[model samples]
Target: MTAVQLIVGLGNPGPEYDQTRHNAGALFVERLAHAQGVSLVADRKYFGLVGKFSHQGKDVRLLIPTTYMNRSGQSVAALAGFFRIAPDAILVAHDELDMPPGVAKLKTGGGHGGHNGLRDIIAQLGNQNSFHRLRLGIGHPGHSSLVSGYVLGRAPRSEQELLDTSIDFALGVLPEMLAGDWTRAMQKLHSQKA
Candidate 1:
């Protein structure tokens, strides 16, 4: 029942990456901030854009690293270290190729599954992969070789709609998540149709 203190959304910086499938994680936080009437401001000290808000009587921080996808750990580790946030108290939102678009999964403690962003975070966190992860599905491109282009490319209209639906649903469950209702939150999210 450890509460989540920090939420990190993974994505590359710059306008070129905007709306791209790979930016699904970043998109989530951006939408979350907007919905909550908050904004993420650049924080050079943390090497990212950050936003703060209170949720269920707890202070929650949202981060979108300005670094390239592979270098995400730099920002995450810096912020986590300075705030003394435990690994288990951190939640990382990142796109997942294994699941189709519109499907999202909440997981805790596992391998990086070849995801560079997750890989870097795991490395920076002393190889302890105990942090929570919000795996936002971006749909695979059918072939491994096409993954890079696929993720970097914008999703189709229908796919975008589905992803948006997932984001909205996840947001609806945020309060419970911040309150450390992990089991209930998982049950609700996982039980939903994508």
Candidate 2:
């Protein structure tokens, strides 16, 4: 069974990064906390904000690293190490430059595709790429040189709406994901409108 116990959202910390495209992952965690009627509180031990919640009676931990994007692994590693969570049982959500704004994908054990956050996580986990990833698309800036500026900036109004819609859709199917129904979850998500 696909036993996902730790959920992590990667992003930079601070109000300035709040609405930027790069914070899409953090946004997902925020939305989830709101919907579940819980608040993520700062946890020094984990070096991030964490909240315990249940899905279909299954316990899960939500984490949002406060250690900035590149050093995200420090927070993730600490939490997972303390909980003894396997790499495969952790699901990390982050923005994906390859996909368009309205799209997201559920994947397992893949390359980081130049994502600094994912790169760090993999390195800290002994170069393991077995963890799950919910790649939230923020759309690319069409040139590598423009990427840094683009992700740090807010998305256009139209794209923002689409991103919100995608986030909502992911939340809706999360029950299936928590239940280890990866096939069903992936099928539903992959086939949805982009």
Candidate 3:
């Protein structure tokens, strides 16, 4: 079963990056914490914000790597290793540029596809990319050359709302995913606007 024990959201730290497209994962984690009524605290050992709360009678841990986007593996490796979590038992949420905003998807064990955060995380996990991923669609800029600037900048008002909508949709299916009802989770999430 792909029961998840840890949820890691990848993004750079600091207020300047908070609303940027690159921080989609981090923003999702913030929404999760808020919904759970728990606050994430800076944890030096993990190199990010850490928090835990009971869900369905089991504890689920949350992490937001503060090691910037590229070095996110350092923090993910730290927390996952200490907790002895298996690669498949962790869920990492990050923005996906290939898809349009409002289309979030669940996937398992795939290449990073050039996403810096995913690339590093796969490396730090000893090349094991078996972990589940919640790819939050953020849509791509018009060209590859504009990618960096686009992802690092805030989405326009309409696109931002779409991104937020996807995150909220993802949140709704978290319970099923955590309970290892993966197929059901995928079905429910896929039914969202594409």
Candidate 4:
């Protein structure tokens, strides 16, 4: 049998966080919402924008948690409870420092890899092995202290074309994700051409 699922994009709220590398996940969702003709403005709160829509003939809910990255667990946990969504059926999209710019990885259940957002999520949900994560690579900085600046910095103008294309690639795979084609979803998403 197929599964009911929720798509959650992790990012901070407000104009201050907008377009920052750390806010890449939210940017992806915004692009998705626009491409799919869905508005994520259903509610305005600390957990970010939440909305619902159908894709690939299944019921789907999209959540943009607003707990400010590290504290995202509180909002995600609340969402899991409020919607009765199982941890396994949840998909979290976030930026990854290990991956180079303009690349995305789709995988399910693993250690948080030092991501504060995923760490908080694991803490609140009480299980690290159940949830799925979509890691969008932002690449690592030369120096650790530069990490913050790297993420929040705007993509180089030369990179914008590739970065924009990745958003459409994400939208293409999302429907398959809702269809429970997890492996297929990854296959279609990973290494997608820019």
Top-scoring candidate (lDDT): 3
TM-score of each: 0.96, 0.96, 0.96, 0.89
* lDDT, model 2: 0.87
lDDT of 3 by residue, 93-187 (tens): 99999889998998888899989999999999999988888999999988999999989999998999999999999999988878767788899
Q: Which residue pairs clash within candidate 3?
A: none
Q: What is the lDDT of residue 174 in candidate 1?
A: 88
Compared with the true structure, what per-residue lDDT tens digits does model 2 show for residues 42-138? 9999999999887656668899999989989989999999988888779898998999999988888889899899999999888899988888989
Candidate 1 has a TM-score of 0.96
Local accuracy of candidate 1 as per-residue lDDT tens digits, 1-194: 88888899999888899899888898998988898887899999999999889876777899999999998998999999999998888989999999887788788889999899999999998899999988888888899999999989988899999998888778877877776677787888987777
Residue ranges of candidate 2 with Cα displaced over 4 Å? 56-58
RMSD of 3: 1.1
Q: lDDT for each of the candidates? A: 0.88, 0.87, 0.90, 0.75
lDDT of candidate 4 over 1-58, digit per residue (tens): 2454677777777788777777777777777667667777645442667776776566
Q: Give the total clashing residue pairs for model 2.
A: 0
